[PDB]
């Protein structure tokens, strides 16, 4: 007559009952993705409905055991991870209204069209057509036209829907003992354990700002660089003591700055590193790339792939007339079944993507022995950060020379180092302020701090202060610009991308120090270093069974986030930028406007 | 002549909880025809050297057969504790015999999935060595009398192996035969 008992039995039954339904659903989904036919379409739903209904039935019975009395942490983690129900606590009609609102928000985004001038035809959509214009076009007028048209078509429709969405989600959050929906999102970082490994939700915000204040000096001197280059592209539309227009950053929204490389090169006379010609001179094929990835992985001290992995995985586009999704994914069907689905080519980007996706397989293989409910990463920010360090380590000149794609006569240079660092920086450092600002705005709008009559004002005011970007045309309260992104129209968390960047560099620095490497961090290589495997293998096996603080400490030696390795990575770029910006101006003043 | 060829080449095997047992006596056992089968995953022997296996004599030979997972083969050993070895089949501490196990993924698996191979996961107390439990009574965990109905806090005692061909290596069906010797 205890609650420690009567809970172990329930979990023992649940694990063995769910490990079959999950496998059936995964197999049906793989069958859908490998070949697309209506018969498979029906089966996908036939499996998903059963899995969802069974999970709901189990969640209904699980809450009868109060979790306060459970003293063992391992059982408590499995029990608490299942007590979460969701929208089932709302009213019957309120449950369907929110689903209708989500569907009518999602349907507009993919069905958005903008008119063309001087002809009723040529109405472009987002994914096929407008992306090309935002990627390659160099005319101010066309970029302004597209930027205004997208937010005049979709934004002006999506605002009342979002006004209802916030109210329904806020009621949902308060129904489940939480404060607001932002507090619901920040429930993924809550850890309980010893007296020093306790992390509360409220501590997350103070860790984002504290870690952001050190990224400011570098970013302010990358921004102040890029602006100057843009003064060549548009001679009379950039202010030397002001911010940057929003429709000139090489993207529809500004999330990435990578498309600006061709306009901002440090030394344009030296060819970049590219070894696709030697991949076809030697005679490689689709299988040899994955074999080389496997050799690299077994070099460091990790297990090799299973016999079935080569038999079930689809490493090439089928030639029997079957249509595929053709997007690189790593699948863990469960019960010792791991697969990789991608359309491999002989390009260098595919060579890196092979390593990136194979990292997920190793991570999943590490914790296959853990119980079913704890087979996930410690937080949402590790499962992608573990795989990216492999791609970082497999793109160094030394590893390529060792494999056989380069000769010994290739000598590294200062200018190529600067070029590679700047290309990395544009992609990595240029996204942090955008993510931080968007997440902070959503957090402050869920709590109701900003009423419905001051949304766009605060949005464009914080755009100038944090990111340094000024709107090209004025916007009143009828518009809704934040809704234009994919992750705002469709409900998705956005803070994982901020933490992943910090984690991937803490891990890289720790592993590099483990392997006895001397020199700049950006040329580290963990090949043939056994002691660099176990240090990693300690964390990967833990899963969610322990608070993420201890899992982090098993690798980095610290207890929370830190930005020192990130600034160690970009030190030569920081010094060079500080040298080139002598007779210029850093910072920005938030009063200049282009429309005036 | 002892008919081991029926035991190691049986067209149908039995489950683990209702495990099958055969008695061998008053015949000449050829122990060298056991190496004419497929390669074996585990061939642990306790107390009798295989090279001297043909050099000794015994009164009775008891052969036990069943089918289990791949992660559970290590539980068939003296002194080891777990789930199969505490609820299904218990081996004596001073065991004198041999254990043979081999993979039968192709023979004992279907694309839809076998569901006639099942095992027991709940029992009140551990099992004395060489004991068979076939009762199918509803398990009792709390204090409410479960009236033979699978309700709240009332569980069915048996669950099925979902053997399928696309599984890994530690989840495919494995066939196990244990030979025990008697000298009295
Ligand atoms: C097992 O039985 C089958 C039944 O036809 C037979 O073909 C096979 O030869 C037997 N195994 C051996 C080792 O003889
Ligand atoms: Zn990834």
Residue numbers in the entry:
A (entry chain A): 19 to 614
B (entry chain B): 335 to 518
Q: Which of the paper's sentences describe this entry?
A:
SARS-CoV-2 uses the receptor binding domain (RBD) of spike (S) protein to recognize its host receptor angiotensin-converting enzyme 2 (ACE2) and mediate cell entry. To elucidate the molecular basis of rabbit ACE2 binding to SARS-CoV, SARS-CoV-2 PT and Omicron BA.4/5 S proteins, we solved the cryo-EM structures of rabbit ACE2 in complex with S proteins of SARS-CoV, SARS-CoV-2 PT, and SARS-CoV-2 Omicron BA.4/5. Q34, a unique residue of rabbit ACE2 compared to other ACE2 orthologs, plays an important role in ACE2 recognition.
Meanwhile, Omicron BA.4/5 and subsequent Omicron sub-variants, BF.7, BQ.1, BQ.1.1, XBB, and XBB.1.5, showed significantly strengthened binding to rabbit ACE2s compared to PT (KD values from 11.6 to 49.2 nM). Notably, although the same molar ratio of S and ACE2 (1: 3) were mixed during the sample preparation, the Omicron BA.4/5 S adopted a two-RBD-up conformation and bound with two ACE2s, indicating a more open conformation. Omicron BA.4/5 RBD forms more H-bonds with rabbit ACE2 than that of PT RBD (12 vs. 9), which may attribute to the enhanced binding affinity. As for the enhanced binding affinity of rabbit ACE2 with Omicron BA.4/5, Q493, N477, and R498 are shown to exert an essential effect. In the Omicron BA.4/5 RBD/rabbit ACE2 complex, R403 of the RBD directs toward Q34 of rabbit ACE2 and forms a H-bond in addition to the H-bonds with Q493 and Y453. Besides, the S477N substitution of Omicron BA.4/5 RBD brings with it two additional H-bonds with S19 of rabbit ACE2, strengthening the receptor binding. When binding to Omicron BA.4/5 RBD, the RBD interfaces are largely overlapped, with Y473, F490, and S494 exclusively binding to human ACE2, and R403 and G496 exclusively binding to rabbit ACE2. Q34 of rabbit ACE2 mainly interacts with Q493, which was substituted to R in the Omicron BA.1 variant and later underwent a reverse substitution event from the Omicron BA.4/5 sub-variant onwards.
